[PDB]
Amino acid sequence: SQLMGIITRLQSLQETAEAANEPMQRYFEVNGEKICSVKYFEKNQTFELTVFQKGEKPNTYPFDNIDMVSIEIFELLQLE
C-alpha cells in the first residue's frame, strides 16, 4: 500500500542519515510535482516536514515519530 511505501522510504532515509552522519532529505511528489520534502535530523531522531505552496514560503513541521510523519505525508498526498 501507499502508506507502507512511505514508511519504508522514511526508514531508509534515517538509516542513510545516521551512517552519513549528516542530515538527509527527500521529496514526495504526485504526478511529477513536488508536494513535500522530509529531512531527518539525527540531532535526535526527528523528521522535519516541509509543505510547499505556490508563490509562498514553505511551512515546516517537526515530528519525532516516523509513523506520525508518514501519516501526515499520506494525507497530504491524498488531497493531491
Residue with smaller CB distance to a second copy, 4 or 79: 4
Q: Which is nearer to a second copy, 9 or 39 (CB)?
A: 9
DSSP state of 78: H
Strand positions, DSSP E, the chain: 24-30, 33-41, 46-53, 56-63
Using the rule CB under 8 A, is 3 a contact of a second copy?
A: no
- Of 2, 3, 16, 45, the residue at the interface with a second copy (CB under 8 A) is 16
**In a 10 Å sphere around its CB, with 0-12 CB exposed, 13-18 middle and 19+ buried, how is residue 74 labelled?**
middle
Cell (9 digits) for 73 = 505525508
Shortest reach from residue 5's CB to a second copy, in Å: 8
Q: Which chain residues interact with a second copy by CB under 8 A?
A: 4-5, 8-9, 11-12, 15-16, 18-19, 26-27, 29, 32, 34
